[PDB]
Design a protein around this nucleic acid. Structure first.
Ligand SMILES: [Mg+2]
Ligand SMILES: [Mg+2]
Ligand SMILES: [Mg+2]
Ligand SMILES: [Mg+2]
Ligand SMILES: [Mg+2]
Ligand SMILES: [Mg+2]
Ligand SMILES: [Mg+2]
Ligand SMILES: [Mg+2]
Ligand SMILES: [Mg+2]
Ligand SMILES: [Mg+2]
Ligand SMILES: [Zn+2]
Lengths: 167, 78, 142, 86, 85, 59
RNA sequence: UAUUAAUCUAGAGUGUGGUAGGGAGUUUUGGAAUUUCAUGUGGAGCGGUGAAAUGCGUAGAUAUAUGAAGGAACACCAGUGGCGAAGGCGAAAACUUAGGCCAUUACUGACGCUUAGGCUUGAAAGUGUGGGGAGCAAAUAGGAUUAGAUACCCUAGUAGUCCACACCGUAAACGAUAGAUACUAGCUGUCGGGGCGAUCCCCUCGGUAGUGAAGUUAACACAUUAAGUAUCUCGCCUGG
């Protein structure tokens, strides 16, 4: 399956916390594919969990069966630093089928590209952008809609009998 | 510091993610974006201020509450 | 030829289906209606247009010959008031009405028509009286 | 876990592209029944699953009644393979 | 035989000789009422003012106070009927 | 409810602090007496509708 | 019409493809806030009310700062909203799991609606056993008010409210409107899928609202989500 752990470890020193992450990696994950890891860095977290105002941030993007969670979830408390850990199963996050759908991905690219052109014009280098058109409504309809409009399945019928048809 | 811009539109602004068609929210991909939707007093702004649609507002709320648990954002002023 | 765009559905009881369609079209001043075609419904429409309450009733078939729908229109005058005044079905499903010839009803003292299907399909009350044979009573139409 | 529907359909199919007959639904239904009895026995407080389990059992019973009324011989064939009676 | 200039919001039954036209434009409205007045003037032997006339004498101006806007807005003065408890 | 005084003037700070306190006082008075879930939901819907109708005409 | 022998897909299902959800159960995790305790500063009231008085306080209260323990519920988000057959569902995560919407050149080929009896679920209070108990509070005690106060106010306060397993099966369990099917003006919102491709907006298919004519009603009112035109099935009513 595809899970995503976000580990939190104390801010002692980078290499030894990396070793802790490696230990936490090879011990658990009963059955697993490649466990690619990142390193978001040291950040000063808002609320001092355990009176701790620092932490190394790691992110794991592994994938595997549902059994990969139980030992890790238990090993975490049985572990050292591991202030927090969240296994965000991305097959249940708020929007995953659309993210896998190819057309929506390609559709998102043109909007990214197209939206960026508008923002540029608004914030022109120095010449005044009189339109300041962004949030406001657009011009006439998107002719492509009128052109590419669907055709309902128009069932064709054939005549058989008649009598008195004013027609 | 000072408010970015006024409601140049109608009495409402516009859902950002809908124009960009972002379609997906990850807390370490648009983290700085989510602090905008959050009010200065560490409180989730309502629709009138945040400007997103119900889905993106609901999506951002779940992500922000998830971020609150990962200890990356404040929880209240005082 | 005649094309459509909307799906055509019908109730399971073929007499009151038509009656509901007819009454609603009459009340709403509507002209073109559609329903699924059955031989009983086709036959009852055959006797109505000879007696003169509706103008045309057209049944069509698909290119595969598996489904048919009959589309009839009502006879409105110039001032837009119909010829049908009220329709009421007697032998509803569950309770089927069987009257002999001697007890054949007369609808609105003969002004209206009573639909009776004795043995050779539907037949108006007067011609049923002429043949001195009775049977199933479908609906009252006036 | 979600039963590999493809394999059960491929096993219970009378002929290809027959992915919507009566036999494949009841074969699928028995698999859904097996999974749901396990899940409900484990939990014992999930009542929506109990409603679904009862509904699936009733649908299977009604489907088997139809296939018994028409072509009873194939009903005998289906019951001995599926072992659903008892 | 009351005649009227329906403007999309009228019941056709009440009127007899319906004359499909506008009613919100101070130019269309003015032209049509005078046209009916013209039928009266013509029979009254008075020289006509707009009927059976060429282009140059029909020209009229648009009253004050791009194109003219015959749009109905002012929707905000129709909230929900005062209720609540 | 952090508000900086800015040390340029005093009044303006209390003009913003009044706002912070009114929204604060709303929840403070909300959490003083215990109501049933039905009455609490009813009062929540009531406040939103009151604010809505006023906002409908505020324009 | 019923019976029998067969054909068909439009009813209803299945699969593939899109897809929205506080749907449910099990196991973990988190922060505000209250209470108690521990440690400092401090020095006379605090508390409560219509006004007060019980009550707490030089044994140092209230307050302020830090820490620890424990139980219960999950601000903002939060709605001219979503889900479920109903009761109901709103901190975060995992596992298991239910139903639903849209498009189907696919498949079975009437397999469908209702349902006496039967089974399942079913707010809160209540019961039995064993835990738990921070806050609140039936019963109870005191102080007020009062002609009297077994009440409204205040200070205390047990069961209970919480958990596990067993029962109880009642509610204004309400949309005071049983379910299913076909048809019947329109307008304004809002939500989902699909089509176009910055939003916004247009169209299609559905869910949830407001206004509104024919139509219905004793009237209020309902009005495409009917209380309208009709059918099937079940339940129920016959003066107080
Ligand atoms: Mg038939
Ligand atoms: Mg403290
Ligand atoms: Mg209880
Ligand atoms: Mg006493
Ligand atoms: Mg007390
Ligand atoms: Mg007791
Ligand atoms: Mg009752
Ligand atoms: Mg209720
Ligand atoms: Mg109304
Ligand atoms: Mg009596
Ligand atoms: Zn949005």
């Amino acid at each position: 399956m595809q899970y995503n752990i976000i580990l939190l470890v104390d801010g002692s020193l980078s290499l030894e916390q990396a070793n802790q992450v490696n230990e936490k990696q090879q011990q658990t994950l009963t059955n697993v594919e490649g466990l690619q890891t990142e390193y978001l860095g040291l950040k000063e977290l808002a609320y001092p969990i355990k009176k701790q105002l620092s932490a190394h941030y790691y992110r794991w993007k592994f994938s595997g069966d549902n059994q990969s969670t139980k030992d890790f979830k238990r090993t975490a408390n049985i572990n050292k630093q591991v202030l927090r850990e969240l296994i965000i199963n991305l097959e249940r996050e708020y929007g995953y089928l659309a993210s896998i759908n190819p057309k929506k991905q390609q559709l998102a690219l043109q909007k990214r590209a197209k939206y960026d052109e508008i923002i540029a014009r608004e914030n022109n280098p120095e010449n005044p952008d009189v339109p300041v058109t962004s949030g406001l409504a657009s011009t006439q309809p998107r002719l492509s809609r009128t052109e590419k409009a669907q055709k309902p399945k128009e069932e064709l019928w054939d005549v058989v009998q008649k009598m008195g048809n004013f027609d | 510091k000072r408010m970015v811009r006024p409601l140049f539109k109608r009495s409402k602004k516009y859902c950002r993610f809908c124009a960009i068609g972002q379609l997906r929210i990850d807390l370490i991909d648009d983290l700085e974006a989510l602090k905008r939707f959050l009010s200065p007093y560490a409180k989730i702004n309502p629709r009138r201020i945040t400007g997103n649609c119900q889905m993106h507002q609901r999506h951002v709320a779940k992500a922000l509450k998830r971020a609150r648990y990962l200890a990356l954002v404040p929880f209240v002023k005082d | 030829m005649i094309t459509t765009t909307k799906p055509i559905k019908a109730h399971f009881d073929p007499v009151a289906d038509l009656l509901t369609k007819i009454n609603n079209a009459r009340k709403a001043k509507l002209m073109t209606v559609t329903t699924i075609a059955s031989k009983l419904k086709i036959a009852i429409l055959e006797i109505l247009v000879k007696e003169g309450y509706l103008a045309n009733f057209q049944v069509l078939e698909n290119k595969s010959k598996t489904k048919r729908i009959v589309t009839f229109n009502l006879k409105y005058t110039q001032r837009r008031i119909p010829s049908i005044n009220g329709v009421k079905q007697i032998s509803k499903p569950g309770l089927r009405i069987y009257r002999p010839f001697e007890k054949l009803p007369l609808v609105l003292n003969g002004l209206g028509i009573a639909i009776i299907s004795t043995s050779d399909g539907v037949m108006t009350d007067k011609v049923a009286r002429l043949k001195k044979i009775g049977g199933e009573i479908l609906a009252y139409v006036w | 876990m979600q039963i590999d529907k493809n394999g059960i359909i491929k096993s219970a199919q009378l002929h290809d592209k027959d992915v919507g007959s009566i036999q494949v639904q009841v074969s699928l239904l028995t698999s859904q029944i097996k999974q749901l009895t396990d899940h409900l026995l484990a939990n014992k407080k999930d009542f929506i699953s109990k409603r679904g389990l009862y509904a699936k059992v009733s649908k299977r019973k009604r489907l088997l009644k139809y296939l018994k009324h028409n072509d009873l011989e194939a009903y005998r064939n289906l019951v001995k393979t599926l072992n659903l009676r008892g | 035989p009351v005649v009227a200039l329906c403007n999309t919001n009228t019941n056709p039954e009440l009127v007899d000789f319906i004359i499909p036209a506008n009613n919100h434009q101070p130019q269309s409205t003015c032209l049509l009422m005078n046209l009916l007045a013209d039928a009266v003037a013509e029979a009254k032997a008075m020289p006509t003012m707009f009927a059976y006339k060429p282009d140059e004498e029909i020209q009229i101006e648009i009253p004050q106070k791009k194109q003219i806007t015959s749009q109905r807005l002012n929707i905000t003065r129709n909230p929900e009927v005062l209720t609540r408890e | 409810p952090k508000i900086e005084v800015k040390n340029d003037d005093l009044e303006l700070a209390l003009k913003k602090f009044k706002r912070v306190s009114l929204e604060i006082r709303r929840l403070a008075q909300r959490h003083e007496y215990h109501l049933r879930k039905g009455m609490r939901l009813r009062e929540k819907r009531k406040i939103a509708q009151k604010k809505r109708r006023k906002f409908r005409n505020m324009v």
